[PDB]
Enzyme design. Structure first.
Site, PDB file in Angstrom:
ATOM      1  N   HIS A 127       0.737  -1.258   0.000  1.00 62.31           N
ATOM      2  CA  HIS A 127       0.000   0.000   0.000  1.00 62.31           C
ATOM      3  C   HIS A 127       0.776   1.325   0.000  1.00 62.31           C
ATOM      4  O   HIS A 127       0.195   2.379  -0.285  1.00 62.31           O
ATOM      5  CB  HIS A 127      -1.088  -0.007   1.098  1.00 62.31           C
ATOM      6  CG  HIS A 127      -2.422   0.498   0.619  1.00 62.31           C
ATOM      7  ND1 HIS A 127      -3.615   0.126   1.196  1.00 62.31           N
ATOM      8  CD2 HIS A 127      -2.745   1.346  -0.389  1.00 62.31           C
ATOM      9  CE1 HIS A 127      -4.615   0.721   0.570  1.00 62.31           C
ATOM     10  NE2 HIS A 127      -4.115   1.467  -0.395  1.00 62.31           N
ATOM     11  N   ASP A 178     -10.221  -1.021   2.578  1.00 56.91           N
ATOM     12  CA  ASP A 178      -9.160  -1.649   3.353  1.00 56.91           C
ATOM     13  C   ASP A 178      -9.616  -2.102   4.736  1.00 56.91           C
ATOM     14  O   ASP A 178     -10.615  -1.608   5.268  1.00 56.91           O
ATOM     15  CB  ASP A 178      -8.121  -0.543   3.575  1.00 56.91           C
ATOM     16  CG  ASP A 178      -6.689  -1.040   3.663  1.00 56.91           C
ATOM     17  OD1 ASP A 178      -6.402  -2.082   4.291  1.00 56.91           O
ATOM     18  OD2 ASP A 178      -5.832  -0.313   3.123  1.00 56.91           O
ATOM     19  N   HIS A 217      -7.490  -1.680   7.135  1.00 55.52           N
ATOM     20  CA  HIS A 217      -6.737  -0.680   7.887  1.00 55.52           C
ATOM     21  C   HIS A 217      -7.031   0.743   7.436  1.00 55.52           C
ATOM     22  O   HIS A 217      -7.636   0.959   6.392  1.00 55.52           O
ATOM     23  CB  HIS A 217      -5.239  -0.959   7.733  1.00 55.52           C
ATOM     24  CG  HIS A 217      -4.871  -2.397   7.934  1.00 55.52           C
ATOM     25  ND1 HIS A 217      -4.804  -3.294   6.893  1.00 55.52           N
ATOM     26  CD2 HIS A 217      -4.585  -3.100   9.055  1.00 55.52           C
ATOM     27  CE1 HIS A 217      -4.495  -4.489   7.363  1.00 55.52           C
ATOM     28  NE2 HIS A 217      -4.356  -4.399   8.673  1.00 55.52           N
ATOM     29  N   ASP A 227      -4.398   3.161   7.374  1.00 53.96           N
ATOM     30  CA  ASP A 227      -3.185   3.630   6.717  1.00 53.96           C
ATOM     31  C   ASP A 227      -2.949   5.118   6.941  1.00 53.96           C
ATOM     32  O   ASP A 227      -2.456   5.831   6.050  1.00 53.96           O
ATOM     33  CB  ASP A 227      -3.228   3.305   5.220  1.00 53.96           C
ATOM     34  CG  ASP A 227      -3.140   1.822   4.951  1.00 53.96           C
ATOM     35  OD1 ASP A 227      -2.598   1.110   5.816  1.00 53.96           O
ATOM     36  OD2 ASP A 227      -3.627   1.365   3.888  1.00 53.96           O
ATOM     37  N   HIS A 259       3.731   1.227   4.615  1.00 59.40           N
ATOM     38  CA  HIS A 259       2.473   0.868   3.965  1.00 59.40           C
ATOM     39  C   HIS A 259       1.309   1.190   4.900  1.00 59.40           C
ATOM     40  O   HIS A 259       0.148   1.068   4.527  1.00 59.40           O
ATOM     41  CB  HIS A 259       2.457  -0.605   3.527  1.00 59.40           C
ATOM     42  CG  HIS A 259       2.234  -1.574   4.644  1.00 59.40           C
ATOM     43  ND1 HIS A 259       1.622  -2.790   4.453  1.00 59.40           N
ATOM     44  CD2 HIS A 259       2.515  -1.500   5.966  1.00 59.40           C
ATOM     45  CE1 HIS A 259       1.531  -3.422   5.607  1.00 59.40           C
ATOM     46  NE2 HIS A 259       2.065  -2.660   6.541  1.00 59.40           N
ATOM     47  N   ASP A 270      -7.296  -2.195  -1.350  1.00 61.10           N
ATOM     48  CA  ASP A 270      -6.362  -3.096  -0.682  1.00 61.10           C
ATOM     49  C   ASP A 270      -7.093  -4.428  -0.552  1.00 61.10           C
ATOM     50  O   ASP A 270      -8.108  -4.515   0.125  1.00 61.10           O
ATOM     51  CB  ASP A 270      -6.053  -2.548   0.720  1.00 61.10           C
ATOM     52  CG  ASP A 270      -5.098  -3.419   1.514  1.00 61.10           C
ATOM     53  OD1 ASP A 270      -4.870  -4.590   1.161  1.00 61.10           O
ATOM     54  OD2 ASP A 270      -4.563  -2.914   2.510  1.00 61.10           O
ATOM     55  N   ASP A 326      -6.685  -6.839   1.285  1.00 65.09           N
ATOM     56  CA  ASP A 326      -6.898  -7.309   2.662  1.00 65.09           C
ATOM     57  C   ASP A 326      -8.181  -6.755   3.268  1.00 65.09           C
ATOM     58  O   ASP A 326      -8.496  -7.015   4.428  1.00 65.09           O
ATOM     59  CB  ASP A 326      -5.666  -7.121   3.590  1.00 65.09           C
ATOM     60  CG  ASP A 326      -5.419  -5.659   4.036  1.00 65.09           C
ATOM     61  OD1 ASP A 326      -6.363  -4.863   4.153  1.00 65.09           O
ATOM     62  OD2 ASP A 326      -4.247  -5.320   4.318  1.00 65.09           O
ATOM     63  N   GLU A 361      -1.486  -4.935  -2.247  1.00 62.88           N
ATOM     64  CA  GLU A 361      -1.262  -5.983  -1.256  1.00 62.88           C
ATOM     65  C   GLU A 361      -1.395  -7.444  -1.669  1.00 62.88           C
ATOM     66  O   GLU A 361      -1.464  -8.331  -0.810  1.00 62.88           O
ATOM     67  CB  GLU A 361      -2.094  -5.690   0.007  1.00 62.88           C
ATOM     68  CG  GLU A 361      -1.689  -4.398   0.717  1.00 62.88           C
ATOM     69  CD  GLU A 361      -0.432  -4.570   1.562  1.00 62.88           C
ATOM     70  OE1 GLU A 361      -0.224  -5.677   2.102  1.00 62.88           O
ATOM     71  OE2 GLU A 361       0.345  -3.604   1.710  1.00 62.88           O
TER      72      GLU A 361
HETATM   73  N1  ORN Z   1      -1.162  -1.295   5.735  1.00 61.75           N
HETATM   74  C1  ORN Z   1      -1.196  -2.050   7.034  1.00 61.75           C
HETATM   75  C2  ORN Z   1      -0.843  -1.185   8.257  1.00 61.75           C
HETATM   76  C3  ORN Z   1      -1.043  -1.944   9.583  1.00 61.75           C
HETATM   77  C4  ORN Z   1      -0.730  -1.138  10.854  1.00 61.75           C
HETATM   78  N2  ORN Z   1      -1.746  -0.063  11.055  1.00 61.75           N
HETATM   79  C5  ORN Z   1       0.676  -0.536  10.766  1.00 61.75           C
HETATM   80  O1  ORN Z   1       0.791   0.683  10.490  1.00 61.75           O
HETATM   81  O2  ORN Z   1       1.646  -1.284  10.999  1.00 61.75           O
HETATM   82 MN    MN Z   2      -3.752  -0.661   3.148  1.00 59.44          MN
HETATM   83 MN    MN Z   3      -4.750  -3.264   4.703  1.00 61.99          MN
END
Ligand code: ORN
Ligand code: MN
Ligand code: MN
Ligand code: ORN
Ligand code: ORN
Ligand code: MN
Ligand code: MN
Ligand code: MN
Ligand code: MN
Lengths: 298, 298, 298
Positions: free
Chosen positions: B98, B121, B123, B125, B138, B225, B227, B270
């Site tokens: 990402h 997503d 998440h 991000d 990412h 994404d 995921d 991803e």
């Molecule tokens: N793109 C996944 C990110 C997952 C988590 N919030 C991190 O910043 O590690």
């Molecule tokens: Mn992401």
């Molecule tokens: Mn994600």
């Protein structure tokens, strides 16, 4: 409100062994850590001592298997739960088969003018020695708590009934014995079988459920049976039934209850590690407990 | 409008190796054939050259791992994407983790008065070096694109911010860091976690999303994404999170976006072949792209 | 009357960093020592906590940079100053850019029927978001105190305006924006630009100023901006302007004020050690403070 965990290693309410390992399976799935993160004053009062059941032979009722051991364990549970409530704490009971609901409700109900119950399950658990096709007490706790059944079960805590039928809401039901369909119909118990869940959607079922109870109870007990979820989501249960609630539907439900702030006590039952796939079921239970207690995605 | 495919074999945005194989996995999953069938003028501009990141201990980058390599690869991506838009073509970016969103939005945003973003997503991000719990870039592309973070990331393309918070809509979120929850809360970013998806339904979420952005943007970039889908549907992802969007919910989303005709650019990220089950995830991506680009059942 | 020093390490009112070091530069220049020698009961209340401005791109209006942080800091200052006055002490505020005058005046004004103001400066500081050519709030404190400007600044202290234009006297002005010239003209503010200082002489300007305010106010606040002196005398200022007041003219002014016994509160602003020649400017400020508080050569 601070929480008090009480494990009830019970399997005498049914025949598949291993459900007595549910309390530790959930502890191992991280129930304390999960709740502590939500800033709770969580306390673990250990497990209720369960006595081994007399063998069927010299035992009395085959329609009421292990009645004395089940009745005695529930007596102890009722006492433990009663004291927790008296101490101003929230009783979180971890089972153990569903027959423990008899002791949990026996210790909680006496503390409410009108205690409501949300029975999240694939079954109705409203059988009696007369209607039970198995003699398994785990299939009778709701009826016994409504005042219907063998006195050894209905009188736990020295009073009955623990709740009124009009204060009960069944959710996720998809496997009722004929006697139970009749009992539900006649006692006028509110019920959302999978048909209503599929037809109305979990959101509407929960909205209607919460509004209904909130309008006529002063406390609500969540009796969550893991077999209420689909065996694919919760494989570790003794009496699984296909076509159940999903993982997401279960979280939404818990989330919506958290929001409603109506749940005053709860118990997660039927987790059997010995029939599961790598503690998956205990895990689901712990995650659901997190949501119930206010854990949120945002 | 003609499409231009740009592969970005990036894995420096996180730690699981293999996500750099995502572009070819999707090409092998048949992205070109799929899109040509919808009678598009599809062109493959190959891949962005990514340089290996120097030792964490040698170059200063831990709350910002591989910053140099990630920042420069995104510079190249920004240019490539900028040129595609200039040529009057739709930029379809295939990742890659990402963090590549930083380069994609850097090349697209300069061309819009008010570019909106749908971030599909698990998440958010929206982490910064300060809030990041992993140091994985990412997990910072959206914040960086909103103008929050290390200048090496926020200044890609010679300008910032690329977008405004009020023009962003998060969908499918179910794993947010504390700093992120606060960021979303305070920047006032519109978000539909899985609770809203479970409560309102994907149709409602998409209707509200499309109407919101359509009412205040002049272009909308889809940052999808994989995921964001449940790990059972999209197993080949580095940071999976259970209880995600289904295959069908994703197709409906893509189908409703196609219908709205609001998506002006997109990126599917991803996809990691090395953590997948027989290219399943690249396949879902390709299928989802077919729908996005107007493929219909009838 | 006892004195209470309050440092306001503020630089958000303009763009040259370092002016937040003014309070400590003056303390190091020996302000306490200087005043104690004149047998004053001098007390240092420390510094007002200043927050870090939010990203410029996310700020509401570019004509009012760092409005939030500047407005909040001034709220705390107004409270601190209000209490000092209530305790029967003289508030001596050390800056910090000129935007802090908003806080100082907000804490003092409420305690007087007709508070007069002597604004010793090269600038008029009577700009609004509409007339400001920079967006720097240190160019708006006088207007905002007169009740003209953004409510966030005009309402500090829960009241407005803090003063009346007929109770204001500007001295040393030599750099006014067009909007400001108009404002001064129309609000009928008394002003002595460098032309008047050169034509009349500092003695006459001060005589006229002291008589004017003394005849119609019940307290006078001295807002002394160090940039009112020539850059050769006071090099450490962020917005210097040539052809300013001399070291001697400034001492005479302070000496004539002390004699007049009309100054009820004061603040010395715009001292920036990072743009100075060996703390020369903080040193002038301190000396000027000594004269104001009655220090004499004979
Ligand atoms: N793109 C996944 C990110 C997952 C988590 N919030 C991190 O910043 O590690
Ligand atoms: Mn992401
Ligand atoms: Mn994600
Ligand atoms: N707790 C499950 C009960 C199962 C069945 N309806 C029975 O009565 O045996
Ligand atoms: N305090 C200095 C003010 C300078 C100029 N009149 C401005 O408004 O920026
Ligand atoms: Mn049950
Ligand atoms: Mn059941
Ligand atoms: Mn000034
Ligand atoms: Mn000035």
């Amino acid at each position: 409100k601070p929480i008090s965990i009480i494990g009830v290693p019970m399997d005498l309410g049914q025949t598949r062994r291993g459900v007595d390992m549910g309390p530790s399976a959930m502890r191992y799935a991280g129930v304390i850590e999960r709740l502590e993160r939500l800033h709770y004053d969580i306390e673990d009062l250990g497990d209720i001592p369960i006595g081994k059941a007399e063998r069927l032979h010299e035992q009395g009722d085959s329609r009421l298997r292990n009645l004395k051991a089940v009745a005695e364990a529930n007596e102890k549970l009722a006492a433990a739960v009663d004291q927790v409530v008296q101490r101003g704490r929230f009783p979180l009971v971890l089972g153990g088969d569903h027959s423990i609901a008899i002791g949990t409700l026996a210790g909680v109900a006496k503390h409410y003018e009108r205690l409501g119950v949300i029975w999240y399950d694939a079954h109705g658990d409203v059988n009696t020695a007369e209607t039970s096709p198995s003699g398994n007490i785990h299939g009778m706790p709701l009826a016994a708590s409504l005042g219907f059944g063998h006195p050894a079960l209905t009188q736990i805590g020295g009073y009955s009934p623990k709740i009124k039928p009009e204060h009960v809401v069944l959710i996720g039901v998809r496997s009722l014995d004929e006697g139970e369909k009749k009992f539900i119909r006649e006692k006028g118990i509110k019920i959302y079988t999978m048909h209503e869940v599929d037809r109305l959607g979990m959101t509407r079922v929960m909205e209607e459920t919460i509004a209904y109870l909130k309008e006529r109870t002063d406390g609500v007990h969540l009796s969550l049976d893991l077999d209420g979820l689909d065996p694919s989501d919760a494989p570790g249960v003794g009496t699984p039934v296909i076509g159940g609630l999903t993982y997401r539907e279960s979280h939404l439900a818990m989330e919506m209850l958290a929001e409603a702030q109506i749940i005053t006590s709860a118990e997660f039952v039927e987790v059997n590690p010995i029939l599961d796939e790598r503690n998956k079921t205990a895990s689901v239970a712990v995650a659901l407990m997190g949501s119930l207690f206010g854990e949120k995605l945002m």
